[PDB]
Amino acid sequence: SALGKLQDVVNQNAQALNTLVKQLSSNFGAISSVLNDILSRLDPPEAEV
Amino acid sequence: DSFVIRGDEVRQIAPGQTGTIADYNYKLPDDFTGCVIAWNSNNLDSKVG
Amino acid sequence: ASVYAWNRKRISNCVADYSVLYNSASFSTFKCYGVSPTKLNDLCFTNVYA
Structure with missing residues (x-):
């Protein structure tokens, strides 16, 4: 644990990137989190929503 | 735009509708602005034969 | 069938x-x-029911 100050910064940046990548898996109230599924399932008036 | 249709087909003169005269007779855009006007004309556009 | 005993048919x-x-x-x-x-x-489906 001698080099914890640099490893803390590296872990925080990697964890922020991992959280940002993980947030794509959330649908945020939509029917799906995949854009291709919405574009292949729905008409543009409701796929727009 | 004036035409004569059935009584159940007046729902298809609208943006974002799926239907028959919407696809092959008269299509409205998704960004349509304006008013659709419909009234019964059984006394004028119908014959006993 | 009637609505209280509605018939469910599998499509597969x-x-x-x-x-x-x-x-x-x-x-x-x-x-x-x-x-x-x-x-x-x-599209392709499974668990289709009428």
Whole structure:
């Protein structure tokens, strides 16, 4: 644990990137989190929503 | 735009509708602005034969 | 069947042409909720029930 100050910064940046990548898996109230599924399932008036 | 249709087909003169005269007779855009006007004309556009 | 004893039929292992359902004018109401009616020929399904 001698080099914890640099490893803390590296872990925080990697964890922020991992959280940002993980947030794509959330649908945020939509029917799906995949854009291709919405574009292949729905008409543009409701796929727009 | 004036035409004569059935009584159940007046729902298809609208943006974002799926239907028959919407696809092959008269299509409205998704960004349509304006008013659709419909009234019964059984006394004028119908014959006993 | 009646609505209290509504009949559930399994649909599996078939290729389905929904265009004869869309192009038929015999249905007074043809309303889809989680999927577009015109995309039904482009997708694959399981657990289809009537």
